[model samples]
Target: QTIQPGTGYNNGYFYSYWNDGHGGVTYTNGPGGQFSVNWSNSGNFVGGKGWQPGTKNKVINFSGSYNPNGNSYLSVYGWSRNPLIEYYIVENFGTYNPSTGATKLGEVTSDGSVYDIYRTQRVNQPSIIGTATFYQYWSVRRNHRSSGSVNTANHFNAWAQQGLTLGTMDYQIVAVEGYFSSGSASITVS
Candidate 1:
């Protein structure tokens, strides 16, 4: 079922969804680090997050089934505290690629593949702590896949090489985001 637009506990994990316009997101939290989400014909923006906090350079392994029609994105998404930064380790997408107009900063090799790294600045956009400006760090895999292990530390180090360092750990999730798109996914992270 659809959850409220905010943070809350889901199967012992914290979860939330945010939207820029009227849209529908139905999800079900499962035992452990497992969850399923479905979004249909969403408006401007709709992002789903389900995870626990404390990702201070820890390795993360994930496996999942994903399907989408239109512009959709699946990634390990999160934020940082002190630095007030947002980050994404994109694994797959449908139709539109998220890096189209963003600045290509660098590239990193992880999970036996290469990811094109990028950094974008948000000007007074909605953020973890309400409306604020922040830097968005991205490492989008050149080859999109539906399941694999993403060593968080690897990307963290990659960003550092670009002078992008994340601060105190914050909640991280394997998210499914859509922009006027339709999508569904069932994921597990450890």
Candidate 2:
């Protein structure tokens, strides 16, 4: 949904949420010109989309807070074509397990912080347009952090060193995702 100050759908920029028969999310421009997401109920995620850089070398700087009553995380989500992989840099907000059926690829430092990396392969997922099945590779950060600047190129290089094949970058999104439960969160990014 379109998000703007005082217009509804929260505030700041255009935002969207995917709720799976559980909770819901609301957006707002919070104090100090920060964008916010207020949510409750079950299995729902909230975040906004930014401009997509076509290459992995693009740098992104983001900072936000996350407070959830249940499981949640703040992350950077993106897509890559050619080999069809979806990837993200997730910062755990509350109590959550980011690694399930994934391989631990060790740890790396970026944005002046250390991140434990994990990879998982997801198959049979529909394309963005729901036309075809694809695979997703998740390079998740297994740390609970509030905010930081994440170097995409550094993460890509680290993944590459692990023999992971990543394609050209397509779309990039930074958001707070709530999984399988009920909770609330507020995030601000500049």
Candidate 3:
């Protein structure tokens, strides 16, 4: 796969994905994936997988909950093989402000069909306030497991805020699925 080029301001970052084995098919670190930015703090983030293109019939499951924080929420986006397909964050899971200790915010489902990507549920909600590090995860499964899962090339890009805006927080992979079987996604910060 080719790396997409972009830029970020105020310590912001832009990341793209590449092929990490798995049959020349590009794969992103899932649910238990991790990454780092700016070299401040390293944390674990979930990864995503789906079919390359043309073929549709995949399901992406989002799970886990994070502390409530303002100005910070999870943004999910989708990318396609052709540059013609514009990449954008589909949903913005609101920020977690309070430390509920261990609570449920609910589950979300996304469509993995072409330009149809996934986004966080809490986009521009007032309740999403505060600026603390939280943990969230999701799963992507394809129909016809016999079809043996679509060898789709996809990625899940995330950002966190330590202050008012997203800082140069480096992310790292903390866990993963043995069945998914893959490495981390290629991240590029500009």
Candidate 4:
């Protein structure tokens, strides 16, 4: 199911998909943006909001507070079109793969904090655009915090310097994802 703030902001819409037995997501807008999810099963579930696609040259900033109950995580999740890669900076990790095949690349400072860098490759995945190989780069904070601005281009450049190529700019997003459990998450984004 999906919900919207009705204000037509980039992140005005909130969406949720249940991959298993029982679980769902909901949202509201007021003094700040609010979202909640509840689940109890063994299927994949995700809830979050997104903005339109734009060039990678643009500076992106995301700030919010997040609280995850049970087994869940709140993250900055999004994808790029040209390179067909999915990227995220996790604020919290429950029982999920905090580091999936992660190889320490290096670290970069953003918004007054340091983030550890890692890269992963995904192959033969289902694709709406087409089937192909994709790469994911993560600049996760060494110490997790609730809010900060992500230097999107900085990350892309770092990868490029290491011979990682990216395609045209694509859509960016910020949201929360859950798997096989029940929980509630609340966040505010601008």
Candidate 5:
């Protein structure tokens, strides 16, 4: 299956996978948010495993291997409704930086790394509930890493300090995303 899977639960955690109908890709979900994915130009992939009813604070511990051939990012990704927000805490990236044209809000440090903050508004796009306008929040790490423990609450507090607020959470995942790239990763989230 090449579509987004889950919106389902796996061992008390939420798991999901989505791609833009192009490229070759495959993934499998394991218990407690453990999963593996291999993609050769999966176009645009956004999915992982995490809490479904997510809160602003939680320590997401992730490990295992990550290797991306081109443009990709290993991140903590999720969404919120009501006020509609999509967020990413990019721990690592390959080839291109995601914050190139985004509005630089400021910077924050987490997991022994300093991350640059950015914000952007997307209109009439697809979302968890449906198509709607929303905001995308970002925290891109200055130094790249593959495995780490992301103090999500720290990032949320950082965003709050910058006037970025969170609404009702949808789901949060420790995700792997690829844009017109090739890669393989085996991750376990706790």
Candidate 6:
């Protein structure tokens, strides 16, 4: 199905800005790589939040090598909080296009609780090869009364397409506008 983007949840704006340690990036609430849903939605939500630093959920498996470029894409896989699970699509930070560039895969929301997962695909920058970099982020309802505190025990995953041969890669998660009561959350990759 086709979904449209919404105004950013914070500051009453249409787009939000994030810093992935390398530089500043912007994410919109449109149909391209951006997405939004009501609390009543259901299914799987993917994208954002990669491997955690000090846990078993910080590893992404791949079948081939990936290259990093300014215009790579990332995808979200899962998120669960006692049954309320959902997934999202992969997006590009350096580039923004609803059809040709990179876009969101739409979200799958559930009814139970609000735990979720965030995953991404290997970087697909055309100019480089042999090095894969994964970028991730997340957008949880930061209202403490609505979703409690954000789950800080999440990770992310990265891999090449099936039936590909490659070598070790360089991966990193771009820090975007995190969603929490205090507005701070990150995803762990495994």
Estimate the Cα RMSD of every predicted model relative to the unseen true structure. Answer: 1.8, 4.2, 15.8, 4.2, 1.7, 16.5
lDDT of 4 at 144: 66
TM-score of each: 0.90, 0.76, 0.24, 0.72, 0.94, 0.21
Top TM-score prediction, candidate number: 5
Worst 10 residues of 1 by lDDT: 43-52
lDDT of 3 by residue, 57-156 (tens): 2233323332212222222323332211212232232232211242322322334322222222233322112232333322222210111112212323
State the lDDT of candidate 6 residue by residue for 1-190, as single tens digits: 1223221332221222232232122222323222221211112111232322122133232111112122332333332222122222232222322124333332222222332323334454211232334333332211112111222223222111211112222222222222111111222222
Measured by lDDT, the strongest candidate is 5
Candidate 5: residue pairs that collide: none
Q: How displaced is residue 47 in candidate 3, in Å?
A: 7.1
Query: Cα deviation of 86 in candidate 5 (Å)?
Result: 0.4
Tens-digit lDDT track of model 4 for 5-72:
22244336433232433435444433333444444443455555455554465444555555555566
lDDT of residue 176 for candidate 1: 76
- Tell me the deviation in Å of residue 127 in model 1: 0.7
Ranking by TM-score: 5, 1, 2, 4, 3, 6
Clashes of each: 0, 3, 31, 0, 0, 51
- Residue 145 in model 6: shift from native, Å? 7.7
Superior candidate under lDDT, 2 versus 3: 2
Write down the lDDT of every candidate, Cα atoms only.
0.79, 0.61, 0.24, 0.58, 0.85, 0.25
Give per-residue CA lDDT, model 2, range 1-190, as digits (tens). 3232222233333333444445355655554325567676655554544444436876655666567777776777677877777677776656666676667777777776677667665555445445556655455565457776667888888878877667766666567677654555555554
C-alpha lDDT of candidate 2 relative to the true structure: 0.61
- Please report the TM-score between candidate 6 and the true structure: 0.21
